[PDB]
Amino acid sequence: FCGSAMATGKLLISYSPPGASVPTSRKDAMLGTHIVWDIGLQSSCVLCVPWISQSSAGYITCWYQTNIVVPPGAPTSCDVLCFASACNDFSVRLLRDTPFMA
Amino acid sequence: VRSMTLGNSTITTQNVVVGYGEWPSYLSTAEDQPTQPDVATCRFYTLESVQWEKTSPGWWWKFPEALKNMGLFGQNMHYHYLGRAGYTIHVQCNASKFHQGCLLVVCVPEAEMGCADTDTTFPATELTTEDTPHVFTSDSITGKKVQAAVCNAGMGVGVGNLTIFPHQWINLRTNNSATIVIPYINSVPMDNMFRHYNFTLMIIPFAPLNFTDGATAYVPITVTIAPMYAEYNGLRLA
Amino acid sequence: VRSMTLGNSTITTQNVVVGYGEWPSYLSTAEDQPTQPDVATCRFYTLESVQWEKTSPGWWWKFPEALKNMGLFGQNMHYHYLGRAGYTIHVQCNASKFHQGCLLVVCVPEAEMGCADTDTTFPATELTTEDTPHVFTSDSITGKKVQAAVCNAGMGVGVGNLTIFPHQWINLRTNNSATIVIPYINSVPMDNMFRHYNFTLMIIPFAPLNFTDGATAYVPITVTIAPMYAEYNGLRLA
Amino acid sequence: VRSMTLGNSTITTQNVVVGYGEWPSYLSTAEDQPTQPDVATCRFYTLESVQWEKTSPGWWWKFPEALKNMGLFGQNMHYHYLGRAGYTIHVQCNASKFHQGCLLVVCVPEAEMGCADTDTTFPATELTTEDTPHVFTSDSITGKKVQAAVCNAGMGVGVGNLTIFPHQWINLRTNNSATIVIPYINSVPMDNMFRHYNFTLMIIPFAPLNFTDGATAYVPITVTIAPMYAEYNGLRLA
Amino acid sequence: QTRHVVNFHSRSESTIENFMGRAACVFMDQYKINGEETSTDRFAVWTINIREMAQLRRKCEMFTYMRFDIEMTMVITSCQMPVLTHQIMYVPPGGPIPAKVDGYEWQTSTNPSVFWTEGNAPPRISIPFISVGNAYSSFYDGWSHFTQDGTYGYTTLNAMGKLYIRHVNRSSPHQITSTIRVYFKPKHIKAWVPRPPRLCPYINKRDVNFVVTEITDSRTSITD
């Protein structure tokens, strides 16, 4: 969370399994897998998404649990950066040519 | 900062008021045998966040049936007609440093509320709207509904001395979070979860919210309930 | 007479053919973690009884998805997209003492069946009608459906030497019950339960039913499946 | 708060990202003998502070020759034609508590940058202006100079996955200071300090600066470099 | 296709030697046998560098520094006689080059060359780590000539040599047009200092110049 040091709110980060459908509402995301990430306490919440392979995948949605509460001095609109890597160890087998290069 | 987790629900927290000095527990017969779900049920059910403005008089939720549409706990209410639970209730406020105010977070077992115009009753959809809270009012009201004026919260008592119950103050000067554990107060070991409202979580702002013309015009209050030690009747033969 | 019980389902039974000499077992990684339901799932799912007349050519069921509407096992198929199970299959016949006949109760893993008029395919609702069985036919048939003529059961093989699979004869002279345990034969440890039919329970009358003009004109065949050691993928984070 | 001092230069600091897990060290021959200055050279060379507004796209410095006019280190570059060093780089931001933003402080060894209009080169004064930084641009540019558009920082790579190098995030919510130690990455033990730019300290604002109408319209970023374990060739006979 | 349980645990195919050490065709060229006694179309050149084709070039730019033996095997054809014999002369970085098919450089004892006659197995010639430094540099943020002169980005440390190829047959009755395919392969490869992958397409084979490309493919909204 790259907002102010005075901005405070909650975000609800839901994960859908690879077969399931996306939550259409915040309550339906709360009934599945989620983490109510309090911004005012910690500013960096870490996941670890399993069952990621190919040879119809999951979803990382994010919801307003609460709005961003801000004092009169700090700005109202903030940003959230995301990151991604291999969680513990990663398995990979069959080398090929990349599609990007032409 | 402690990141509690239960099942597939993790919240982020920042002292617990154990209601009546007791921690919820199981009931411990072959004539009547309880079923202990344990699986799921115990996860955190975060309700919808409630905006607290300068003119908000209060709110109340009536449990156990406030969770009647909340997942497996709200689905085991339809298959078993007897049950009991513990309901760890976290109440955050995540206001700023320039906001001021104070809340009474109290649980009030057996809150029998009174109708607005006496000599009649209310249509039973005025006590509870499952997930969403019924607000109080600042003055007296009429009509076939609950007399929801503060200073006489629901029961005809003074609202100031509502502190006799399991309570917690949320003074935005000092703290923001409250947590209450309510170990199933009832006169029968198991009761139906749709007829009987075991307790009434009501959040009442004593000192009103105040701020200046730059802050956000509200403070969202977040309510989270974890049904602990929920056990039900048996469905199998003996 | 042994009265087996599993969960909340008790049947009454009267030797087990363990398929390929192996008893089903669990798969035993943090990159992929299975969930073992154990609770429910293992109970007995009795299908609808099937009347066996003098002119019945046979039946087949395609599992795992024959149980797609059977309780929690048929509901965990919709929430998890990977799974495996064992399927203890009891087949009673409860005929009389004056009825005669013989059945082949065989399981046939990976029964890829052929269309009735080749050069085309069938509309996918011809292989399975969940609970109810597709019957075979006594002669050849046409149309966009399964070539269900016996002597070429589904796969273009001889129906007599279908005994290579886990089988059991039900000779009404001697016995009436069959039981087969099929320890999840597949080339991948877990697979989707709606795309892939792991095996095909087909019951084929070799010697036809016969009786005189006083007996009941049929013999009801009762099929009971107990999904053993069912495990699924994980839905929680790591 | 730790008040580090080196020679006659003291700074005031508030965790170190040791680049590639190695601390700079000396090279340990009579055919070629290095000279270790130790005296001076190791002191802190604070560059000019850089104002970070809401519309700043980024900056870059090219070392070792960014210090080409900095004291004895910038004077030993003219007398010795071979050298190596370590360059502890402190990056403070000293913003307020109501400012918000985020920086990527990355070092990028061997940042070969691309010309703005390809089919030609740039006049060599576009990569570096000794002490002062070349800014990036928000969009594409033309002319005989460096293609300094962010999202393609200098090298034609994605600017988001520039985190593979020795980096440090400066999130003004949490921290303000960064420190990186870069242990002389090169394919030859000693190289000329005017031809070859060993690494490129580039500071890139991912989340832009934001504030309200009362704060200061900028945040000064302070860069401080301490050349560690600098050693040169020998000038004496053998 | 369908999403299967891809269950295994292996990273032996992700090591550097199992990622870079793969033979790829890097040089097709024609060269005649007769006519035009002073011509440049009777032999091949191919200055050896990793920046030949963009598919391999992209893999060498994962890493800043790398050192490796190279083991190339030519595949020589012919069109249109006797049995033909070829010559694949590798000159080192310090080595004289021919100007014509009949130059005296072809007879230099310090330029190793294979004499492959047609019909046999393909000729294989292996070259060790030649460079003066301690590794080949994929990128060189520096100037060849001191005091910021011309030729940005080109160091002389990552020079690998050249590969002059000709027929040894002096003449022929008719025209024979031979085609050679050089199969480059890194061997015993080490690599230092990882580096983010190339995003933009390549422009030229001696520079890093590029057109500003978008980061990823765009989608409609942030939530779809």
Cα–Cα distance measured from residue E141 to residue D186, given in angstroms and rounded to the nearest whole number: 11
Calculated CA dihedral for residues C135, C137, C140, C141, nearest 10 degrees = -50
Alpha helices (H) in chain C, listed in sequence order:
71-79
Token pair of C70 as six digits: 């059977």
Q: Closest chain C residue to B6 measured between Cα atoms?
A: C236
The answer to whether the Cβ–Cβ distance between A101 and E55 falls below 8 Å is yes
The answer to whether the Cβ–Cβ distance between C189 and E9 falls below 8 Å is no
Residues E22, A102: contact at Cβ < 8 Å?
no
Within a 10 A sphere around the Cβ of D31, how many other Cβ atoms?
Answer: 5
Quote the minimal CA–CA distance from E10 to chain C in Å.
Answer: 13
Contacts of E154 (CB under 8 A, 6+ apart): E140, E144, E206
Using the Cβ of A94 and the Cβ atoms of chain E, whether some distance falls under 8 Å is answered with: yes
Which chain B positions have a beta carbon within 8 Å of A42's beta carbon? 1, 3, 12
The answer to whether the Cβ–Cβ distance between E11 and A92 falls below 8 Å is yes
Between the alpha carbon of residue B131 and those of residues B96, B109, C113, C127, C136, the distances in Å are 26, 19, 52, 45, 54
Residues C237, C219: contact at Cβ < 8 Å?
no
Residues E102, E150: contact at Cβ < 8 Å?
no
* Binding residue ranges of B for guanine: 23
Residues A93, A87: contact at Cβ < 8 Å?
no
Token pair of D65 as six digits: 């020759």
CA R_g for chain C: 18
Within a 10 A sphere around the Cβ of B52, how many other Cβ atoms?
Answer: 23
> How long is chain C?
238
β-pair partners for B221: B50
Using the Cβ of C195 and the Cβ atoms of chain E, whether some distance falls under 8 Å is answered with: yes
Cα–Cα distance measured from residue D215 to residue D212, given in angstroms and rounded to the nearest whole number: 6
Residues C35, C233: contact at Cβ < 8 Å?
yes
Using the Cβ of A25 and the Cβ atoms of chain E, whether some distance falls under 8 Å is answered with: no
Which chain A positions have a beta carbon within 8 Å of E201's beta carbon? 101-102
The answer to whether the Cβ–Cβ distance between E3 and A53 falls below 8 Å is yes
In this structure, what DSSP letter does residue C209 have? Answer: P
- In 3D, which of D152, D166, D228 has the Cα closest to residue D200? D166
Cα–Cα distance measured from residue D137 to residue D145, given in angstroms and rounded to the nearest whole number: 12
Using the Cβ of D174 and the Cβ atoms of chain A, whether some distance falls under 8 Å is answered with: yes
DSSP D119-141: SS---SSSS-BTTBPEE-BSS--
Within a 10 A sphere around the Cβ of C20, how many other Cβ atoms?
Answer: 11
User: Which chains contact A through at least 3 pairs of Cβ atoms less than 8 Å apart?
Assistant: B, C, D, E
Closest in D149, D158, D187 to E134, CB measured: D187
Calculated CA dihedral for residues D151, D156, D160, D161, nearest 10 degrees = 180
Between the alpha carbon of residue E72 and those of residues B138, E158, E186, the distances in Å are 89, 18, 9
Between the alpha carbon of residue D183 and those of residues D71, D75, D76, D85, the distances in Å are 21, 21, 19, 7
Cα–Cα distance measured from residue E194 to residue E143, given in angstroms and rounded to the nearest whole number: 23
Which chain E positions have a beta carbon within 8 Å of A56's beta carbon? 3
Cα–Cα distance measured from residue A33 to residue B69, given in angstroms and rounded to the nearest whole number: 17
Q: Is the dihedral of CA A54, E21, E142, D227 positive or negative?
A: positive
Contacts of D105 (CB under 8 A, 6+ apart): D89, D91, D167, D168, D169, D170, D178, D180, D201, D203
β-pair partners for D171: D102
Which chain E positions have a beta carbon within 8 Å of D122's beta carbon? 152
Cα–Cα distance measured from residue C135 to residue C149, given in angstroms and rounded to the nearest whole number: 9
Which chain A positions have a beta carbon within 8 Å of C33's beta carbon? 50
Q: Exposure pattern of A24-43 as b/e (b: 16+ CB <10 Å)? A: eebbebbbbbbbbbbbbbeb
Residues E116, E76: contact at Cβ < 8 Å?
yes
In this structure, what DSSP letter does residue C85 have? Answer: -
- In 3D, which of B168, B171, B127, B170 has the Cα closest to residue B146? B127
Cα–Cα distance measured from residue A67 to residue A63, given in angstroms and rounded to the nearest whole number: 10
Cα–Cα distance measured from residue A15 to residue A33, given in angstroms and rounded to the nearest whole number: 5
Backbone angles phi, psi at B210, to 5 degrees: -145, 150
Experimental resolution (Å):
3.4
* Residues in E lying within 8 Å of C, measured between beta carbons: 2-5, 7, 9
**In chain A, which among 61-80 make CB contacts under 8 A with chain D?**
71, 73-75, 77-79
Token pair of C1 as six digits: 């007479």
Q: Closest chain D residue to A79 measured between Cα atoms?
A: D207
Q: Closest chain D residue to E213 measured between Cα atoms?
A: D152
Cα–Cα distance measured from residue C104 to residue C171, given in angstroms and rounded to the nearest whole number: 9
Cα–Cα distance measured from residue C113 to residue E175, given in angstroms and rounded to the nearest whole number: 63
Q: Closest chain E residue to A56 measured between Cα atoms?
A: E3
In this structure, what DSSP letter does residue E106 have? Answer: G
CA B167 to chain centre: 11
Q: Closest chain A residue to B219 measured between Cα atoms?
A: A69
Residues D109, D45: contact at Cβ < 8 Å?
no
Which amino acid, one-letter code, is at E52?
A: E
**In chain B, which among 24-83 make CB contacts under 8 A with chain C?**
39
Three-state helix/strand/coil letters over D36-84: CCCCCCCCCEECCCEEECCCCCCEEEEECHHHCCCHHHHHHHHHCCCEE
Residues C16, C179: contact at Cβ < 8 Å?
yes
Q: Domains in chain D, ordered, with CATH?
A: 1-238 (2.60.120.20)
Cα–Cα distance measured from residue E119 to residue D2, given in angstroms and rounded to the nearest whole number: 76
In this structure, what DSSP letter does residue B42 have? Answer: S
Residues A58, B32: contact at Cβ < 8 Å?
no
Token pair of E24 as six digits: 């790829």
Between the alpha carbon of residue A37 and those of residues A64, B89, B94, B227, the distances in Å are 10, 17, 12, 21
Which amino acid, one-letter code, is at A5?
A: A
Which amino acid, one-letter code, is at C90?
A: H
The answer to whether the Cβ–Cβ distance between C80 and A15 falls below 8 Å is no
β-pair partners for B5: B10
β-pair partners for C45: C225
Ramachandran area for residue E140 (φ above 0: left; ψ -120 to 50: alpha; else beta): beta
Q: Domains in chain E, ordered, with CATH?
A: 1-224 (2.60.120.20)
* Binding residue ranges of B: 23
Which chain E positions have a beta carbon within 8 Å of D194's beta carbon? 146-148
Q: What is the largest CA-CA distance in chain A?
A: 56
**HSE-up (13 A, CA, CB side) for residue A92:** 11
Quote the minimal CA–CA distance from E171 to chain A in Å.
Answer: 41
Which amino acid, one-letter code, is at C203?
A: I
Which amino acid, one-letter code, is at D12?
A: T
Cα–Cα distance measured from residue D228 to residue D27, given in angstroms and rounded to the nearest whole number: 13
The answer to whether the Cβ–Cβ distance between C195 and E2 falls below 8 Å is yes
Which chain B positions have a beta carbon within 8 Å of C8's beta carbon? 235-237
The answer to whether the Cβ–Cβ distance between E13 and A90 falls below 8 Å is no
Using the Cβ of D81 and the Cβ atoms of chain A, whether some distance falls under 8 Å is answered with: no
Which amino acid, one-letter code, is at E95?
A: G
Cα–Cα distance measured from residue B67 to residue B78, given in angstroms and rounded to the nearest whole number: 12
Way it was determined: cryo-EM
Question: If residue E19 lies in a helix (H) or strand (E), which one and from where to where?
Answer: helix E17-20
CA C70 to chain centre: 14
Cα–Cα distance measured from residue D58 to residue D47, given in angstroms and rounded to the nearest whole number: 16
Question: If residue E54 lies in a helix (H) or strand (E), which one and from where to where?
Answer: helix E54-60
Using the Cβ of A84 and the Cβ atoms of chain D, whether some distance falls under 8 Å is answered with: no
SS3 E32: coil
Closest in A4, A43, A77 to D98, CB measured: A4
**In chain D, which among 106-125 make CB contacts under 8 A with chain E?**
109-115, 118-119, 121-122, 124-125
Place of tokens 């060790």: E128
Token pair of C107 as six digits: 């399981």
Place of tokens 């363990």: C18
Check contact D-C (3+ Cβ pairs < 8 Å). no
CA E101 to chain centre: 22
